[PDB]
Amino acid sequence: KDKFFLVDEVENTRDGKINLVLQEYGEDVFINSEQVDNSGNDIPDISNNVLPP
Amino acid sequence: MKKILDSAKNYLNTHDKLKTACLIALELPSSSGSAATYIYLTDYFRDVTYNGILYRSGKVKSISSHKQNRQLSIGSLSFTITGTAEDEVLKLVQNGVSFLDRGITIHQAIINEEGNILPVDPDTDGPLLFFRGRITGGGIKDNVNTSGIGTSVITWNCSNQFYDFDRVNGRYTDDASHRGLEVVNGTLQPSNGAKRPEYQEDYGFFHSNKSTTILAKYQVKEERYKLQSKKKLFGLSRSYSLKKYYETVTKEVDLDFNLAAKFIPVVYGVQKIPGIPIFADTELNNPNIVYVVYAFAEGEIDGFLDFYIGDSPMICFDETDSDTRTCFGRKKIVGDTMHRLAAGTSTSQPSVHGQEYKYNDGNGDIRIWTFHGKPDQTAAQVLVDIAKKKGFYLQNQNGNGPEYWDSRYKLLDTAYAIVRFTINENRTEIPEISAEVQGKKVKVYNSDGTIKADKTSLNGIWQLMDYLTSDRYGADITLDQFPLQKVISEAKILDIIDESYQTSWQPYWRYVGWNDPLSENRQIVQLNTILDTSESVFKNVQGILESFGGAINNLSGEYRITVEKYSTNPLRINFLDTYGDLDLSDTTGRNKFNSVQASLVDPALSWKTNSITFYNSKFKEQDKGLDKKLQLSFANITNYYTARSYADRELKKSRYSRTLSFSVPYKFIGIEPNDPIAFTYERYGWKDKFFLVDEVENTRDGKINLVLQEYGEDVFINSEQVDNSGNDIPDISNNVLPPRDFKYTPTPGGVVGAIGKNGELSWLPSLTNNVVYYSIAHSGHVNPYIVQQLENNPNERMIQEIIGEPAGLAIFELRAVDINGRRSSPVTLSVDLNSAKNLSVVSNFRVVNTASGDVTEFVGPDVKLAWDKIPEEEIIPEIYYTLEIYDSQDRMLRSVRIEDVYTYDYLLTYNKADFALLNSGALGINRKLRFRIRAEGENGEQSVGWATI
Amino acid sequence: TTQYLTLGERQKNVDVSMQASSGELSYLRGDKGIGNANSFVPR
C-alpha cells in the first residue's frame, strides 16, 4: 500500500511506453530522516493458541 | 563413488517406472534465535511422511539441477514456487530479504509401490540427499495478459554446502571477541556466545589491542647518591661526588607501544612466523627491562625450533655464518633446535612448554619463555609473580593491583612466548621477533581404528581434515560427515614413498619437517602450511588442495576428499547403457605445458623466496621451444625435492588430455567427480578405457550428465603400483556392541553462558573397538547430537549435556559407528525433562471487577484479569504468559498467549460467540469460569505450579 | 636525558557501528594517549 520506491532507470519510447526500473530501500536509510529513537521495549501483542484435542 | 543399498540397486534395475519425489525441508526465519520453525514441501502429488515429518505438497513447481565438478566452487540451485499461493507470495514479497542465509535441504526420494519411501542411503536407510545449503535472494514475476492466461512464478536461489565455507573463522586477539562479551550497545558485559565456555574466564588477551604512547617518567634507581666508583690517581684524593649507587633519579622515557589486533595463524609442519605482541611493558624502576608477549600459533603445537631476533636466528646455518655472527651450534646437518641452549641434546628435541631459555649474542641478554598452546594451561608464573610485586610500570601508572596479570590470564589454546629484552647501548630498541615453530598436533586416524594425535603431520589429507573438523579456527564440520575409510586410504595414497632422491641429499632435514634423520621421510607429498585465518576458509581450503592436486566435493551429504589416482576397480559403463548422445573432444593442444615457475621458500637461505623454474627440455623440443608455464602453487611446500617431483609429475600429466561428455540414466546414481570409469564402446576400439569423472550433474528427472577426462597411460601419482586387499576391501568387523549406562540425570539449577540448562545424559562406550564417535538422535530435532570418543574412553564413560530444551518428554536414541560405517543397534531412553529455568510463579492473580459484597464474583459483563509482572524478568530477555480458561464442568475454552502486557481483558462477546457455540454449537453464556496462567520464557523456560484465583 | 622504546604500529581500523568520539581523531593523527581507535584517551 503505497510502498516507497525510487526510480533508477527510465526509458522513453516513441510509442509512449515508458519502461521503468524502480529501486527498493530499507526503512529510514535516506539522508533526510531517521527514526528519532528505536523502540526501547517489546511491543505488546495478543495471541491465541491451538486448543488441544 | 557413493555406494547405495543392495536393495536400492535391485529395485532400480528391476523397476522401470520410478515415482520420485523431492522433499524440501526449508528453514523459516524468526525474530529471536530461541524460536525455530521449518516449512516442509514436496512436488509429489500427495503429502509424503518421512521420519514423522509431513512434507506438504502442491506448492513446489520445479527444481533446477545440481552441478559440481573437480574445482572447489560455490554451486547454486534454484527451485520455483507457484506464485498463485498467497502464503508464498506474501513471504517472498514482504520477507524475501529476511530469508537470506536460511538453510534448505532437498531429498531425492523414490516412492515404493506401497507408497513408502524405498531405503536407498545405507547410512540411515532413507532418501539419498540431493542438495543442502542456504538461500541467497529471491524473485517473483507476474506477467498478466489482458486476453489470455497470465503466470505468477516465485523463484528461490540457493547455494550448495560450500556456501558455509565463505565464513572467516579465526581467533582474534581482541579481548572482547575472545571472551565473547556482548556486542557493545553502549555497554559491555559478558554473553553466551563464545568458542568455548571456559574462555569467558580467560583474560589472556586483556591489555592487548590497545596503545600506550606517553612520555612516562621512571624513577630509575641508582646514579643519584652513595659512594662513586672513581679513585683519583693521587693516593689521598677521593671523588666525594656521589653517584653510580642505589638512589632514585628522575628519567624521562618516551615509550611507544602499539599492540595491534591481528588474526592468529594456524601452522602445520615446520614454518617461520612472526610475533603478534599481546602485552608489552617494562619494569617499574628500570626502563631497560621490557617484557613483551607474542602470540605465534594456535592449538597444541609442538615446541619452537628457534627464535629470529631481528633477522639473525640464534642458531646459525653454516660454519661461515657461525664465524660471521657468533652463533650457537649449527642447523645444516646437525639440525639443532632451541633446546640446544638449555642443555646438550642428543636429539633435536623442540622447545619445552613452560621452559625458560637464556640467550646472549654479545649485544645483550634475551630471556625466552616458550609456552605452547594447550586445552588447559595455567598462567605465566613469572608474569604473575612480577605483577604481585607491582613490578610493571604501566600497572602502577594505571593503578592496577595484583589483578593486573592474574592467574586467570591463562592464554588458552594459544602458543605464546614471553621475551625479556635487557635494553642496552648495543640493543637500543625492540627488534621485531619471529620464530620457527612446529605445527599443530593433528589426529592421524589409522585404518585399524586407533588414532594418534601426539605429533604434527605433513600429510595433506590429515592437515585438511584437521582444518575442516575444528570449530575454533576452521570450517566446523562434524566427523559424521566423512567416509573414514576413504579418507584413510587417500592419506595412504599421499604417503607413497618417492624414489627420485635419497634422504642424505637434503641437508636441512630438521627444518623441512623430518623429525628424524634416518627414518623414511620421503613421502610423495609433504606440506608445511601457514593457514592465515584472516583469509576466508574457502581460500584456505583451496590453497591446501592446490598443493597436491586434490579435490573436495559434497554430493549426498558426504564430504569426499579425493585425488586423481589410478584404480583397479572402476565402474564399468557401456555405450549402450548411456543415452544416445556422445561427445569426444581433444584439448591437448591448449593444455600442453612444458615449464613451471616455482617460488618456494628455502630455509637454508633464511625463509626467503627462491625464484626457481622447472622445465622439461624434451617437452620444449616437442613444443618447438615455445614456453608454456602452468601456474602452480608452491606456497605450502618447503622441501625442494618434493616440489620438484610435484612439478615434473604435473608437467607429465598435462601432455595427454581429452574430454568425453555423455549422459547416463538414473541407474548410476551417486557417481562422484574424480571417479574411475571403465568406458567400453567397441565401434571406437575402446574396451574398459580408463577415464576420470570431471563434472557430474544431477537432474530431478534422474538423468545424470557426465563429463569425463582422459589421461596418459601412467601419468597418475598412483601409477605403477598394485593395491593390496586390506586397503581395497574393508575387513569383516562385528556389529558395534550397544553403549551401556545410557541414563539421564536432571540438573536442578543449570546455566551455561547465562542460558537455561536442562539435565545431562551419559552412556558407557561400546565394547567393540574402533568406534570413532557416538551419535545420539533427539526427537523433534533434525541434527543428531554427535560426540567423538577418545583414547581414554575405554575406561571412563563419556557424557553429553542438553541445554535449553523445554520441559516435557524427550526421546533420545543412542547408537555408535565404526570406521567402516558399522553401527550399533540404537539405544532408546524415553524420559520427561524439567524446564531449563524454573521461573517464579506469578506474584498475584485477581479480577479487578470483583463484587465488594463477596469475593469471587464479577459484576460487569466483561471480566478484567490482571496480575503482577513476574520477578527476575530482567534475567530473561523475552518472556510471555499462557492463560487457559476452563468451564464449570472442566472443558478448556481458550488458550491465550500474552506478551509484554500483564492485564488481560476478557470480553462478553468472546464468551458467547467464540466459546458457547464452539463448545455446544448453540448460543449460550458461561457464568462459572476458571483461569490458570503460567509464565514461560523462550529457551525452554517454564514456570512451575500454574497460578489461579 | 631522553630515551624512547617503540613497538608496533597504530591500527587505523574504525568501527562505525559505535557512536563517534574525539578519541578517534586523537588516535588517527598520532596523538599521545592510552587507548584504541574505538576508545582513545588523549591525555
Coordinates of C-alpha atoms in Angstrom, one line a residue, chain B residues 216-224 246-253 282-287 393:
Chain B
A216 CA 56.3 8.4 31.0
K217 CA 58.6 9.3 33.9
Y218 CA 60.6 6.4 35.6
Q219 CA 62.3 6.9 39.0
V220 CA 65.2 4.8 37.9
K221 CA 67.2 3.5 40.8
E222 CA 71.0 4.3 41.2
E223 CA 73.0 7.3 39.9
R224 CA 71.9 9.9 42.5
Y246 CA 71.4 2.9 44.5
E247 CA 69.3 6.1 44.8
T248 CA 66.4 7.2 42.6
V249 CA 66.8 9.8 39.9
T250 CA 64.2 11.1 37.5
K251 CA 64.4 9.9 33.9
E252 CA 62.0 10.7 31.1
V253 CA 61.5 7.6 28.9
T282 CA 58.8 -2.6 31.3
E283 CA 59.9 -2.9 34.9
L284 CA 58.6 -0.4 37.4
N285 CA 62.0 1.1 38.2
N286 CA 64.3 0.1 35.3
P287 CA 63.1 1.1 31.8
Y393 CA 55.4 0.4 35.3

